[PDB]
Amino acid sequence: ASQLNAVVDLQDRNTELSYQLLLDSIGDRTRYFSMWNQAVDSYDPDVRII
Amino acid sequence: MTFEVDPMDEPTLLYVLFEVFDVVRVHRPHRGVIETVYLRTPFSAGNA
Amino acid sequence: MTFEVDPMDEPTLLYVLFEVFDVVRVHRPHRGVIETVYLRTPFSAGNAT
Amino acid sequence: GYNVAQCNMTKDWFLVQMLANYNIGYQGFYIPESYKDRMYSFFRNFQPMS
Amino acid sequence: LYPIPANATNVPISIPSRNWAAFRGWAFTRLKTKETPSLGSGYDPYYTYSGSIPYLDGTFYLNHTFKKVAITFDSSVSWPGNDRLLTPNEFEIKRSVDGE
Amino acid sequence: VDGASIKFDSICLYATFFPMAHNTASTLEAMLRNDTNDQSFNDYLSAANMLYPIPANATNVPISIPSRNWAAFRGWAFTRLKTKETPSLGSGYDPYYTYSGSIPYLDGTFYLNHTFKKVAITFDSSVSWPGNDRLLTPNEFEIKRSVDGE
Amino acid sequence: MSKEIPTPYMWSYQPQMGLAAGAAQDYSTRINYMSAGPHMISRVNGIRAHRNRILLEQAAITTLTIRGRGIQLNDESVSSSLGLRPDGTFQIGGAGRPSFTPRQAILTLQTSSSEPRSGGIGTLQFIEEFVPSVYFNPFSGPPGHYPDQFIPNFDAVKDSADGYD
Amino acid sequence: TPSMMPQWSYMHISGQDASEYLSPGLVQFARATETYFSLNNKFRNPTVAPTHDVTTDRSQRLTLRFIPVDREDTAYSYKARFTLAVGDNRVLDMASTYF
Amino acid sequence: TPSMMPQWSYMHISGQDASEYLSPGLVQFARATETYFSLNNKFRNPTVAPTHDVTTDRSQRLTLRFIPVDREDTAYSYKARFTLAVGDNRVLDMASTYF
Amino acid sequence: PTHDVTTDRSQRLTLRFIPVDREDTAYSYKARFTLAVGDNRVLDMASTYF
Amino acid sequence: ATPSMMPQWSYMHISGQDASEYLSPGLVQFARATETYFSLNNKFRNPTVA
Amino acid sequence: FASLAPRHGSRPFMGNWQDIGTSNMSGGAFSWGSL
Amino acid sequence: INFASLAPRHGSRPFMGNWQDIGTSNMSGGAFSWGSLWKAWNSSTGQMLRDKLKEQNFQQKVVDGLASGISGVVDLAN
Amino acid sequence: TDPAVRAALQSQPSGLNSTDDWRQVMDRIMSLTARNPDAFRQQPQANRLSAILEAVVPARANPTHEKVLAIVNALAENRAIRPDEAGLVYDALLQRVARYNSGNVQTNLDRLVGDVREAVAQRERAQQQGNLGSMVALNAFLSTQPANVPRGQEDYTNFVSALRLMVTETPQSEVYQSGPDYFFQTSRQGLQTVNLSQAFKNLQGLWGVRAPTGDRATVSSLLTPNSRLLLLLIAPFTDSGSVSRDTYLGHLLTLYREAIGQAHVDEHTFQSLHSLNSEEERILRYVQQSVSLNLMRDGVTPSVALDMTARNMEPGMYASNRPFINRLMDYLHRAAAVNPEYFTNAILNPHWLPPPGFY
């Protein structure tokens, strides 16, 4: 009816990292859910630290 | 603030996240009408 | 107040005239006497008694 | 335009399975809580491939 | 006059709380530091220039370099505080190539 | 440069509605339009982010913030990352972003936290926030030490 | 200056918490008469006295179709049109006439909060309550008898809030 | 419930749950001896879902599909605009929405 | 609008909780349909640290290094005695101590 | 004048309306808008433009 | 201190009133008030008698 | 009452009245926490 | 105006959830349960497969949906 | 919590229902308590024995710490020392007693805890009673002031008595002397401080001669604003007729008194008969559903439809609601017999309710 925008996105605020941390917080992250392509990146510990 | 880090031979950037309060209140007093009130307390719109 | 300006190599200054009211009233009791009373409402010169 | 999870399964069927086994339907598609997802549960064995 | 360093892009200003009775409004312009003299007593030995004086004569010519002006009272309330602008709380003067 | 290419074709939006009974749905609607029963949210990171350049072989990163009001301020959080691995903020397309790996500013895979030496805090260009003799070294949070006989 | 006609003190608001921050003498509206004779100086003093009288006093004395929420809505209880309900046989297609039930919908739409608040003050009430206060004989008592509300760094319970922790 | 067949209630299919149809006494006994002799796994506690005012009987979809009303393209980014509609007697939880 | 309430009571920072500022109808509704229609994550509850009578504003150490006051090294054992001093109006929890 | 001119409740000064219908052709272009004047303000059509 | 003649079984909290009983009302209130940050709950024994 | 209970205090240790229980594979569960 | 009829019935008694459950979480101080608990160069075969099986499944204590299991004791990993 | 230093203490050094109150324990252990008898008869053996062993032979206690803490807490609540000083002084006094102890010392200590309890109570009630110190200061100041006014005397002494009454009747008000003057603060940490000496000096010349001149504002500027505040603070006092009217002072007092009066007063003022129970509505909806189902899928007659519905009801609820269900069935029966359109409408349309007169 009146295009009063509801999303006021700033540039200082960072959303991607925020969603990453939220996803870590509320549930296990080691599991994989293919729908959202949800698979946290990680390195083999025997490779980072020999 | 005065950080200091070990030398690195490539440009790099310190990233500081200034912990703040970032909330939004959403209202909807009729059909198909959205009114919002954003607010960031430590650094509102007049940020540095 | 926060400002954003394009980069420039020389130093520069932002002048921010702030408007105010600035009023002078003049009164004269006798021959050759001038008495003035100044004022500036949002940025006063200052005098208290 | 009906498959999901980047595999050949209709979103209708996926929605029905998720609703029946964890009630994770209408309000988003978060990974089920671990205790609600036993070994014979739907999710833990669902493997998309391509 | 509030200073701006070389290549600096943000010029924040603060004013300690005071009464604002009968206030009227703002007005601003950028001047090259070499131009405006030190607003003091006669001789400014660091003032070495003899052209126009936009602070004095009124020949302002840098108003085209302003980008954003944000006004906030008590650091929590923006002054046009009723969403009375297309942008939320900034007096966006000129928009760059980001032409939404 | 490697020529990898992508071309979107179509996009549709899917929504799922709980089939609420009409009376109950209408009652819920009339409830949620109250002046008081309003919805509210807060970003999980609750952050304000800023980034600061550090040139090659640099060893000191001064940062100054002008006069500010610090109500409700919660704390600090910082990390260090390569400039080559972070896109330009806001701008639509950066033609210099010649990199394709992990993006720590986005996906949150930081790997340089070990490089920090020490952090100093100063308010009003005078006092120090760590505080009244709180830590071992009262002036500055010392993260890691080289050879230190203490 | 004068302990009888004092420049008033004007409060400072903190929007965020709703409390009132420290105040101070007004320093933006002073009149500079330092270049005037006794006539105008007495006139100005009388004017400031009049202003103080106005302040003291003010402060002390002065402390169907319901509107819904700005767009009125009509109200009907027996407006039920589609009397059918789908039993084993019928199959009702798209329908729905949104009508506010008189008691259920409207009352549920206009209930107040469950328990009233207890905390800070909004802007309008602050304007109505915290007029500038005239302090007549400044700090004329023994230590501890001074108005501590004026210092912004003073906390009511724990006295003299140490800044910087 | 009116249409509750009494054989159900006797067979603990619907009606009073375990803590109530049992004699007060056993209840207490059980509460006490919880630590050592369990006795909670041997009686039944019926659970019944509600019937009315929870689900719409009239024909209504579950997974609505909205198409892009307008789309813009550029050499680096493109824009898609949808006219999201939520008819009356409905509520949409944005968490389910996904492009 | 901030003209109604302070900006912290509004925007649901320090102030009443969700089960208190919401209308009774909505609270009862959420308590009823909790099992199959979540409404918990769509509101806010402030978490306010206590202001006073917990920490001290005065200067006070957080950690002390107690040099041994006396040692008696032996061919089989090392003996160290520390004059552990706990200052006034401070409480030491021995669990944090270590050699 | 102090009062009875400008409101205190929020209003926006400017509204941007998105066309609801559009039609391209070899030579024409039809756009349709749903102009919505608020419930208390008034609109002078002279200010509107495409 | 003061030598006591209470039965050692209760004087050593081997068998007797639990923590929230033999402790002071003031100390109990204080411990319950600061349960979050500075935990005092493990400094007092709670006898358990079968 | 009951004297047959472990007593962790002078007060007895007794669980909730409502403790007796059920689950059918069904999904007649998929139900929430003890909390 | 009573909404008890909408709730599942646990037997002559509505299943009204605790009113104290409305979400709130932020960066620090907000913690939720269900934590991240968890060509062979080495041919052991056995424990290996077993370990893989372990890796795909679960265990904790507030997993009290339904029942803990017969005779009891109250334990940790809260 | 509590101000009584005995009470605010005894919360700190005391168990809960131990053998300090022997009578209650002895009552509860045998059977005597009526609130919950047989509680003690069914506790484990150890506990039972231990209490009993405690009960028959009590164990002596050392009350030194309790008394010392009581007196320390009394000092703290009476602003003798700061709370940190309280923590220190508790140990200080404890050492003092421990290195000089005797039976006489314990007796004096009990005497002292009684005395400090009484002292705290007296200090609180006196602080809420009127603060005699202010009265003493005011009397000293009035002795400094002369008691004779050449122009008018009744108004002067009446005003003096009014001021005395004002300072007496409102506690928390402060009267003191800082410099070579006396002042009057209406509250600690409060504004409105009146320079009493200056006010009286200014008012000395306006007592008995401003009555005829009250009509003309020729001498109105003689009233310094400080004295104006002083008069304003005594508007509620010095009621009508105390100060002779038609006097500038009297006129101001009367105006101020009238104003304050309207204010407080205004401020204290401030600011279908039968409808069904949810169970009966459930029954009605069930009857509608069952009758409609039978009548629509089985084609039976409406009377047989009503009969078939009835039987299939839960016997407990059917017996519990026999009258209402019977009346509803009879009403629907006669409606279906008489007015088929009305019956079909009332059996097929939800949101229907029985019309008034059906009761």
- Closest in G14, G96, G109 to F30, CB measured: G109
- What does the angle CA N298 – CA N304 – CA N306 come to, to the nearest 5 degrees? 100
Identify the CA nearest to B21 among candidates B1, B46, B41. B41
Does residue N307 lie in a domain region? no
* Helix extents (H) in chain N: 5-10, 22-30, 45-56, 64-77, 83-98, 103-127, 132-144, 154-169, 196-203, 225-233, 248-269, 278-297, 302-311, 315-320, 322-338, 340-348
Give phi and psi for I87, each to the nearest 5: -65, 170
CB contact under 8 A, G85 and H57: yes
Instruction: Please state the three-class secondary structure of chain I as a single string.
Output: CCCCCCCCCHHHCCCCCHHHHCCHHHHHHHHHCCCCCCCCCCCCCCCCCCCCCCCCCCCCCCCCCCCCCEEEECCCCEEEECCCCCCCCCCCCHHHCCC
CA-CA distances (angstroms) from residue J16 to E87, G29, J12, J36, J50?
12, 43, 10, 11, 10
Distance from CA of D34 to the nearest CA of H (A): 21
Residue with tokens 């209708």: D12
* Residues in chain F within 8 Å Cβ distance of A25: 44
Confirm if N178 and N160 have CB atoms less than 8 A apart. no
N32 & N150 share domain: no
SS3 label, residue H88? coil
Domain-embedded: residue N314: no
CA neighbor of H61 nearest in space, from D29, D12, F25, I37? D12
- Minimal Cα–Cα distance from K21 to chain N, Å? 5
DSSP code for K32: H
Question: Is residue A10 helix, strand or coil?
Answer: coil
Q: Within 10 Å of residue I78's Cβ, how many Cβ atoms? A: 8
Report the alpha-carbon angle G105-G109-G111, nearest 5.
120
Q: Is H81 on the interface with J (CB under 8 A)?
A: yes
Q: Is F73 exposed, middle or buried (0-12, 13-18, 19+ CB in 10 A)?
A: middle
Q: Does G49 touch chain C (CB under 8 A)?
A: no
Q: Which residues of J6-20 are buried (b: 16+ CB within 10 A; e: fewer)?
A: eeeeebbeebeeeee
Asked whether A4 and F38 are in contact (CB, 8 A), the reply is no
G64 Cβ contact partners less than 8 Å away, ≥ 6 residues apart = G74, G75
Amino acid identity, position J21: D
Residues N227 and N261 in one domain: yes
Q: Which residues of I touch D (CB under 8 A)?
A: 35-38
Q: Among the three residues N129, N158, N186, which one is the final residue of a domain in this structure?
A: N129
E vs D contact (3+ beta-carbon pairs below 8 A): no
Distance CA N327, CA N171 (A): 73
Tell me, what DSSP letter sits at residue D38? -
H helix runs in chain G, sequence order: 38-61, 104-110, 123-129
Task: Tell me the C-alpha distance between E100 and F90, whole Å.
Answer: 13
Q: Cα separation of E90 and E96, whole Å?
A: 15
Q: Are N199 and N227 in contact (CB under 8 A)?
A: yes
The residues near F51 (Cβ < 8 Å, ≥ 6 apart) are B13, B14, B15, B16, F86, F89, F105
Q: How far apart are the first and last CA of chain C?
A: 33
Report in angstroms the alpha-carbon separations of M27 from E91, G111, M31, N172. Answer: 32, 34, 9, 48
Best E15, E17, E20 residue to mutate vs chain G (most G CBs within 10 Å): E17
Closest by CA to G11, choosing from G125, G120, G131, is: G131
CA N117 to chain centre: 24
Please name the amino acid found at residue H96.
S
Report how far residue G78's alpha carbon sits from residue N305's, in angstroms, rounded to the nearest whole number: 28
Q: Please indicate, yes or no, whether residues N141 and N45 belong to a single structural domain of this protein.
A: no
N176 belongs to a structural domain: yes
Q: Taking a C-beta distance cutoff of 8 angstroms, is the pair E67, E87 a contact?
A: no
Of the candidates N59, N44, N47, the one whose C-alpha atom is nearest the C-alpha of residue K14 is: N47
User: Are N139 and N265 found together in one domain?
Assistant: yes
| Cβ atoms within 10 Å, residue G133 | 18
Nearest partner of G84 among F24, N288, N301, judged by Cα: N288
Q: Of N245, N271, N297, which residue constitutes the final position of a domain?
A: N271
Contacts of H86 (CB under 8 A, 6+ apart): H92
Chain F within 8 Å of I59 (Cβ-Cβ)?
yes
Total domains, chain N? 2
d(CA G156, CA G161): 9
Least Cα distance to I35 among D15, L24, F30, M14 occurs for M14
Inter-chain contacts counted by CB atoms under 8 A, chains B and G: 6
* Number of CB atoms found within 10 A of residue J27's CB: 5
- The C-alpha atoms of residue B31 and residue F48 are separated, in whole angstroms, by 34
For residue I46, which of G71, M26, N358 has the smallest C-alpha distance? M26
N148 and N123 share one domain: no
Alpha-carbon span I21 to E11, nearest angstrom: 41
Chain G residues in contact with B30 by the CB 8 A cut-off are 69-71
- ∠ at Cα N298 (N296, N300), nearest 5°? 90
**Beta-carbon count within 10 A of M66 CB:** 15
Distance CA N116, CA E9 (A): 69
H97 in the Ramachandran plot: left (φ > 0), alpha (ψ -120 to 50) or beta? beta
CA distance N71 to N5: 8
Give the domain-ending residue among N69, N96, N129: N129
Cα of H27 vs its chain's centroid, Å: 29
Write the DSSP assignment of M3-70 as a string of letters: -GGGSPBSSSSB-PPPTT------SSS---SS------SS---HHHHHHHHHHSS---SS--SS---S
Residue N59 lies in a domain: yes
Per-residue H/E/C for N198-218: HHHHHHHHHCCCCCCCCCCCC
From I41, I51, I56, select the one nearest I14 (Cα to Cα): I51
Count the Cβ atoms, other than its own, within 10 Å of residue N16: 14
Residue N4, domain member (yes or no): yes
- Reduced to 3 states (helix: H, G, I; strand: E, B; else coil), residue G27 is coil
Going N234 to N235 to N236 to N239, the CA torsion angle's sign is positive
Distance CA F33, CA G73 (A): 14
Q: Say if G25 is an interface residue toward chain C (CB within 8 Å).
A: yes
Q: Which long-range contacts (CB under 8 A, 24 or more apart) does E33-37 make?
A: E33/C10, E33/C11, E33/C12, E33/C13, E33/E3, E34/C10, E34/C11, E36/C13, E36/C15, E36/E1
**N143 and N110 in one domain?**
no
DSSP L1-25: --SSS-BSSSS-----S-------T
DSSP N240: B
Residue carrying the six token digits 């904790």: M60
Q: Is the dihedral of CA G30, G34, G40, G45 positive or negative?
A: positive
User: How far apart are alpha carbons M49 and M51 in whole angstroms?
Assistant: 5
The single-letter DSSP state of residue N250 is H
Distance of CA N223 to the CA centre of its chain: 43
Q: Domain containing N182: what range?
A: 133-271
E80 Cβ contact partners less than 8 Å away, ≥ 6 residues apart: E71, E89, E91
CB F31 within 8 A of CB I34: no
In a 10 Å sphere around its CB, with 0-12 CB exposed, 13-18 middle and 19+ buried, how is residue F124 labelled? exposed
Instruction: Give SS3 for B18.
Output: strand
Tell me, yes or no, whether N301 lies in a domain. Answer: no
Contact N16 K15 (CB under 8 A): no
Angle at H73 between CA H72 and CA H78, to 5 degrees: 85
CATH code at N76? 1.20.120.1500
Nearest to N311, CA basis, from N291, N297, N292: N291
Q: Which residues contact K33 (CB under 8 A, 6 or more apart)?
A: none
Reading the block at residue N4, the tokens are 């009584």
Could you give the CA distance from residue H39 to residue L20 in angstroms, rounded to a whole number? Answer: 7
Place of tokens 């946290």: A40
Residues N137 and N125 in one domain: no
Residue of D nearest to I42 (CA): D27
What single DSSP character describes residue C16? E
Measured distance CA(G119)–CA(G122) in Å, rounded? 10
What 3 state SS string does E5-69 have?
A: CCCCCECCCCCCCCCCCCCCCEEEEEEECCCCCCCCCCCCCCCCCCCCCCCCCCCCCCHHHEEEE
Q: Which tokens in the block code for residue N191?
A: 């504004």
- Using alpha carbons, select from F42, F123, F48, F44 the residue that is nearest to residue F78: F48
Q: Which residues of chain A does D29 touch, with a Cβ-Cβ cutoff of 8 Å?
A: 33, 35-36
User: Does M57 reach chain F within 8 Å, measured CB to CB?
Assistant: no
Backbone angles phi, psi at N168, to 5 degrees: -75, -40
**Bridge partners, B13 (sequence order):** F53, F81
Residue from N290, N294, N314, N320 to probe the interface with H (highest H Cβ count within 10 Å): N314
* Range N201-206, long-range pairs (CB < 8 A, 24+ positions): N202/N226, N202/N227, N203/N227, N203/N230, N203/N249, N204/N149, N206/N248, N206/N249
